[PDB]
Design a protein around this ligand. Structure first.
Ligand code: CHL
Ligand code: CHL
Ligand code: CHL
Ligand code: CHL
Ligand code: CHL
Ligand SMILES: CCCCCCCCCCCCCCCCCC(=O)OC[C@H](CO[C@@H]1O[C@H](CO[C@H]2O[C@H](CO)[C@H](O)[C@H](O)[C@H]2O)[C@H](O)[C@H](O)[C@H]1O)OC(=O)CCCCCCCCCCCCCCCCC
Ligand code: CLA
Ligand SMILES: CCCCCCCCCCCCCCCCCC(=O)OC[C@H](CO[C@@H]1O[C@H](CO)[C@H](O)[C@H](O)[C@H]1O)OC(=O)CCCCCCCCCCCCCCCCC
Ligand SMILES: CC1=C[C@H](O)CC(C)(C)[C@H]1/C=C/C(C)=C/C=C/C(C)=C/C=C/C=C(C)/C=C/C=C(C)/C=C/C1=C(C)C[C@H](O)CC1(C)C
Ligand SMILES: CC1=C(/C=C/C(C)=C/C=C/C(C)=C/C=C/C=C(C)/C=C/C=C(C)/C=C/C2=C(C)CCCC2(C)C)C(C)(C)CCC1
Ligand SMILES: CCCCCCCCCCCCO[C@H]1O[C@H](CO)[C@@H](O[C@H]2O[C@H](CO)[C@@H](O)[C@H](O)[C@H]2O)[C@H](O)[C@H]1O
Lengths: 61, 37, 51, 252, 56, 35, 219, 221
């Protein structure tokens, strides 16, 4: 299946754009990494999940 | 070309090599934002 | 890490499909390098050779 | 007991400050998981405590200790399982006459003709003339007592099960999960601080085997081969024999 | 043939030696001057402990 | 020609070994700046 | 008996003036045999008892391991090379060194690998025997018994002193038999069980005097 | 004993850390004391003096011997026309037709009679081996092992800190050369070639030209 791979890869681009902007903002704000810790962990664990989804979906094409 | 399950993403790929030129420019923006301290 | 990285090239040439040999008989293609040259007079002969 | 160093000087249990207390290793490093976000019931009192409970399944140190009853048995069975799955497949693939060393078809290999072959390495190989009816009969009997010997707490008085002491008595005040009296023929439990460090090695070897036997069952269901066959074929051809070459194999 | 050559223009000899006396020139002159440096090493400082270089 | 080659290899290796063992003979301490 | 002055001797009854003074009978195997006087210094006599017992414990492992590959070959186990002075060369064989007969077993091919593994492993456990290691630190240099007597046989020190004599007398026989095996291989050229089988076949002719003219210098 | 790192109680020993306490008579006093007397052969402190003055003479002959066995085969590989460049065949040069030529040169020494060589050697060695025992022209009352004087013309034994250091270098160079000269003996008996030929044969293929090539060589029958 091809179309769910392209949706999952578009989603990988938006999540990566959320990390390329957001993660340096969360880091270098004062006391921002303690407050926004679980957001970035949910962002990284989604980003890492989306990479292994697209790689497994590439096997089905 | 790319594999055809990824060829719609080929517009993003043409922008990807020039990105480390923007990383040396970002060090000048960050130092301009702290006024070159 | 550089030593184990240099064994990645040896494992890929000896075991993991081989590498491209342009001097292969029959034209250049991918050749598993079954007999790599471990002779120290040949290996360290390049290093002391003139440039 | 006096424990000179394995290679050089003084050895034994150097520091248990990596495994117990506030200072100890965790499941995330200290810039991602500080010492205030550890749950209050996970303290440095159990071996292998990394502060790992994101799904709140632990409640208090008495519920954690009764799941520790479940964790350490699941550890010690999966460790015997992990050696019992790789080794007979490894011997059969290298030349032993096991006929069923692959783990997921050993049961159907011995159905009506019987005679599941057994390899007493290195003493050669022996046929096993026990029918499948007896294997169902002996196992439920011989191990239903042992799982009752851990409930009732009272072993048989006579010591005949491969004992290094021959102390024909019962011992009932022993620690659950750690009956170190008759179950230490080699000893290795006299110094309680190196015993507290060996039970860190016991649960980590256990948690490594529980993940691996889970890895056995999944990758045998997917690939259709045993884990020794998955191991020697991924080492033979890594990029061409992966998870990702196995999935989607029906198209080319 | 017509003249006399040394015949080592593209032969790839180790350090460009083809008479074995040339290798003993290399080891003799290195060995003579290693030995002068070694005997004269008592005037260079005994940098024996660990923090004993030109460091920063 | 071989007499010339032996002579040049004595000469060149004399000066190369002056170079190498000169920097091994405590060059970084030959500064005027004290520490 | 076996200790004190009123013990067994190396000449038996004709040994009352034969034994020296320092061989009292407080060490096992002391039948009073120091005819060349090598062990007169008690510091060296301490060293030679360590040299004797470690030689005894390597010869007992030797004399059992130079025999059981040749018995099982008479029972039908194929080894490649079952005779002990040919069993080293079977690692250069075409299938390597299978342990009894199974290629599912050790299946060693590289002699430099199994030697370098041995130098690392034996270099540690012979070092553990000297200074101490994981099984003990300050025990007897010849009789550790903490981890090396798991079955409790180093109890009752009266009968434990008997076990030291049973150790060395089994051990001295094995050393006398390993000196056998070496010479009965150089002279004969066949295995020691093969040396046993033809002396049991014909004791008259199949002895060591049938090979007495082997080492004659004929020039 | 000084604080010379090779002497006294905290000295390097022959099993490193696994050696334990050395024997009580090996107090770190004399050079090359790695505490290796496991046979107890030198427990007597008078035999231990004899074995010290027997080790070092063996060491000084084997250091000359190991240099003396490599050097005619090293030059023999480089075109010097020796009769036999190999060391264990170098005796038979007296038995060939032209005799024994030093450096393969016919108008150097040109020995023809082996009985003249041995008759000269017994007279000359017997004079100087006895000088090593007592007296002599180059020194009369000196040390038995380290006489100095005429046998230290460069003065390299003046500083006793340096002299106790160089005695450690002498015995370790000597024990290495005795252990290597024993290698010359065994690997000429076993292989049959020169030690520089055994080296270059090993360097051409170390996997096959090791000592296990000749492991079945002395097999009976
Ligand atoms: C407790 C762990 C356990 C696991 C993970 C399995 C796993 C399996 N058994 Mg099983 N067995 C287990 C316990 C036992 N089995 C058997 C006797 C059998 C038989 C006779 C058969 C299985 C079969 C199977 C398979 C059924 C699907 C699966 C691979 C079947 C199989 O191997 O088909 C391929 C099969 O025919 N097992 C006995 C003896 C009573 C067991 C004892 O507890
Ligand atoms: C004397 C009879 C007796 C027999 C035959 C067994 C048999 C067994 N117990 Mg049991 N037990 C017995 C008495 C008792 N056990 C226990 C409590 C335990 C625990 C906690 C565990 C065992 C385990 C075991 C197994 C491996 C033990 C071992 O290290 O083997 C090597 C030497 C032989 C084995 C099936 C272990 C197991 O496999 O469970 C996962 C284990 O963890 N037993 C108690 C105290 C309540 C006993 C009372 O005497
Ligand atoms: C901690 C590791 C360590 C180990 C294991 C050793 C071990 C040894 N050191 Mg020591 N050292 C070590 C640390 C250090 N040493 C030294 C300094 C020295 C010196 C100066 C010397 C030693 C020597 C020795 C040897 C002394 C006893 C002996 O000969 O063994 C006897 C037993 C063996 C050699 C085993 C045999 C090896 C092999 C497996 C057998 C091969 C089998 C053949 C195929 C059989 C032959 C077939 C037949 C038919 C011919 C031994 C190999 C001495 C030496 O080299 O003598 C040889 C020596 O002179 N060591 C230093 C610097 C302080 C160390 C630093 O830590
Ligand atoms: C350092 C002492 C010394 C040693 C080790 C040798 C060794 C040898 N000489 Mg020799 N020589 C020595 C001194 C002298 N030689 C000679 C004159 C000759 C002649 C004319 C000939 C020899 C030959 C030989 C070789 C016989 C071949 C052989 O037996 O193979 C087996 C042995 C080995 C391969 C080496 C093993 C050496 C040895 C067994 C161990 C060394 C320890 C000794 C037991 C110590 C003995 C020395 C004593 C006397 C102090 C043998 C390697 C013959 C030859 O070259 O044949 C090819 C020969 O024709 N020698 C003179 C002048 C008189 C010597 C003066 O001291
Ligand atoms: C009379 C002349 C005389 C001659 C020709 C020799 C010859 C020799 N002596 Mg000898 N000695 C002589 C007198 C004496 N020696 C000694 C005591 C010794 C010792 C202890 C040793 C020698 C050794 C030697 C050899 C090496 C010399 C050396 O180290 O050179 C180097 C110095 C300048 C180039 C050489 C064979 C050494 C030996 O035999 O080892 C192979 C050795 O260890 N000699 C004494 C007592 C002080 C002598 C008294 O006059
Ligand atoms: C075709 C072939 C072409 C030729 C081959 C080409 C390739 C060659 C590459 C070979 C590798 C070269 C690497 C050399 C590294 C040298 C580094 C160094 O600066 O090395 C420095 C060290 C210094 O060592 C230490 O030096 C110290 C100096 O002490 C002195 O000073 C001390 C206080 O400082 C004390 O006072 C003490 O008493 C006093 O002696 C101590 O003595 C220590 O014991 C000692 O370990 O040297 C050492 O470790 C040993 C150094 C290595 C050995 C050098 C051998 C040289 C050649 C010998 C053969 C010559 C042949 C002559 C032929 C004649 C006939 C023609
Ligand atoms: C050269 C690289 C390098 C080095 C020396 C360090 C060193 C350290 N890091 Mg940093 N880190 C690195 C790379 C590196 N890191 C990278 C690439 C990442 C992104 C994943 C991080 C993310 C990271 C975090 C988020 C934290 C640290 C922390 C730490 C500290 C120790 C805890 C630890 O093991 O890290 C944890 C990292 C891992 C467990 C990753 C697994 C590494 C294992 C060893 C496998 C390695 C595989 C292989 C050998 C390397 C890749 C091969 C090839 C691709 C090059 C230590 C100072 C902690 C710290 O400073 O606390 C205050 C901390 O909180 N690191
Ligand atoms: C700034 C850095 C510049 C870039 C450097 C990049 C690396 C270049 C050097 C590495 C390659 C050369 C390796 C050694 C080659 C060699 O041995 O040459 C060996 C050559 C061989 O010489 C010729 O060889 C021929 C056979 O091929 C024939 O035999 C000829 O007769 C013979 O003359 O000798 C030279 O070319 C000159 C070398 C001497 C000059 C060295 C200057 C050193 C200065 C001090 C260095 C201190 C350290
Ligand atoms: C310590 C100890 C301790 C414990 O306790 C006990 C024990 C073990 C017993 C001990 C040990 C010991 C040992 C090791 C020994 C060894 C030795 C040696 C080897 C020597 C050599 C030794 C050796 C030597 C001298 C040698 C020498 C040599 C020489 C001179 C040579 C000569 C020559 C030459 C030039 C050349 C020609 O062409 C020939 C010839 C003629 C040949
Ligand atoms: C992979 C990918 C991605 C990522 C990307 C990235 C990583 C990016 C980055 C980017 C960047 C990182 C950018 C940057 C930029 C910067 C800039 C653009 C700047 C400029 C500047 C200028 C122009 C100016 C300068 C100056 C100053 C200010 C001072 C000095 C002087 C001057 C004037 C020069 C994403 C997610 C999308 C997804 C898809 C794919
Ligand atoms: C910073 C870290 C960076 C690490 C990056 C590592 C990148 C390595 C890139 C190599 C990937 C090549 O992998 C590739 O190998 C084989 C060659 O086609 C393929 O596998 C298969 O393909 C071909 C036929 O289908 C055959 O010639 C191969 O024998 C077969 O194994 C794999 O399907 C493919 O995945």
């Amino acid at each position: 299946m091809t179309s769910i791979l392209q949706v999952a890869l578009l989603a990988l681009i938006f999540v990566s754009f959320a990390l390329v902007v957001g993660v340096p903002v969360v880091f270098a704000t004062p006391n921002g990494w303690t407050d926004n810790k679980g957001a970035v962990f949910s962002g990284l664990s989604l980003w890492l999940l989306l990479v292994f989804v697209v790689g497994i979906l590439n096997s089905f094409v | 070309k790319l594999p055809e399950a990824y060829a719609p993403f080929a517009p993003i790929v043409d922008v990807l090599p020039v990105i480390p030129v923007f990383f040396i420019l970002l060090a000048f923006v960050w130092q301009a934002a702290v006024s070159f301290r | 890490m550089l030593g184990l990285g240099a064994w990645l090239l040896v494992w890929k040439a000896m075991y993991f499909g081989g590498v491209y040999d342009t001097w292969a008989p029959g034209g250049g293609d991918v050749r598993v390098i079954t007999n790599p040259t471990t002779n120290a007079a040949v290996i360290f002969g390049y290093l002391v050779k003139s440039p | 007991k006096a424990t000179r160093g394995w290679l050089g000087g003084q050895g034994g249990a150097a520091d248990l400050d990596k495994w117990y207390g506030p200072d100890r290793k965790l499941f995330l490093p200290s810039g991602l998981y500080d010492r205030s976000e550890i749950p209050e019931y996970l303290n440095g009192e159990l071996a292998g405590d990394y502060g790992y409970d994101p799904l709140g399944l632990g409640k208090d140190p008495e519920t954690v200790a009764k799941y520790r009853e479940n964790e350490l048995l699941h550890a010690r069975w999966a460790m015997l399982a992990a050696a019992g799955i790789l080794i007979p497949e490894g011997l059969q693939a290298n030349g032993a006459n096991i006929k069923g060393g692959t783990w997921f078809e050993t049961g159907a290999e011995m159905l009506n003709g019987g005679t599941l072959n057994y390899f007493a390495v290195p003493w050669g190989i022996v046929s096993n003339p026990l029918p499948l009816f007896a294997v169902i009969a002996v196992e439920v009997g011989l191990m239903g007592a042992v799982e009752f010997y851990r409930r009732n707490g009272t072993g048989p008085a006579g010591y005949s099960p491969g004992i290094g002491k021959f102390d024909s008595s019962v011992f009932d005040g022993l620690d659950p999960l750690y009956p170190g009296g008759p179950f230490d023929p080699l000893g290795l439990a006299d110094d309680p601080e190196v015993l507290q460090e060996l039970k860190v090695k016991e649960i980590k070897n256990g948690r490594l085997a529980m993940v691996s036997v889970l890895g056995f069952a999944v990758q045998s269901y997917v690939t259709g081969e045993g884990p020794y066959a998955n191991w020697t074929k991924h080492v033979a051809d890594p990029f061409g024999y992966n998870l990702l070459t196995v999935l989607g194999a029906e198209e080319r | 043939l017509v003249d006399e050559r040394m015949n080592g223009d593209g032969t790839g000899r180790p350090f460009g030696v083809n008479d074995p006396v040339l290798g003993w020139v290399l080891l003799g002159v290195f060995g003579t001057m290693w030995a002068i440096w070694f005997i004269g090493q008592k005037d260079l400082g005994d940098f024996e402990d660990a923090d004993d270089g030109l460091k920063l | 020609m071989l007499t010339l080659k032996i002579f040049v290899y004595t000469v060149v290796t004399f000066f190369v070994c002056l170079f190498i063992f000169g920097f091994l003979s405590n060059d970084p301490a030959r500064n005027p700046g004290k520490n | 008996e076996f200790y004190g002055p009123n013990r067994a001797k190396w000449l038996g009854p004709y040994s009352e003036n034969a034994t020296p003074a320092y061989l009292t009978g407080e060490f096992p195997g002391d039948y009073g045999w120091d005819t060349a006087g090598l062990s007169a210094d008690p510091e060296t006599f301490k060293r030679y008892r360590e040299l004797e017992l470690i030689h005894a414990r390597w010869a007992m492992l030797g004399a059992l391991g130079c025999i059981t590959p040749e018995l099982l070959a008479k029972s039908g186990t194929q080894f490649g090379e079952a005779v002990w002075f040919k069993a080293g060369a079977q690692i250069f064989s075409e299938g390597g060194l299978d342990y009894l007969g199974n290629p599912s077993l050790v299946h060693a091919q590289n002699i430099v690998a199994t030697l370098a593994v041995q130098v690392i492993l034996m270099g540690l456990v012979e070092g553990y025997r000297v200074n101490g290691g994981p099984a003990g630190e300050g025990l007897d240099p010849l009789y550790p018994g903490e981890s090396f007597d798991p079955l409790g046989l180093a109890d009752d020190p009266d009968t434990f002193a008997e076990l030291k004599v049973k150790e060395i007398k089994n051990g001295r026989l094995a050393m006398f038999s390993m000196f056998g095996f070496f010479v009965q291989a150089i002279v004969t050229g066949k295995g020691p069980i093969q040396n046993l089988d033809d002396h049991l076949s014909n004791p008259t002719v199949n002895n060591a005097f049938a090979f007495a003219t082997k080492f004659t210098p004929s020039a």
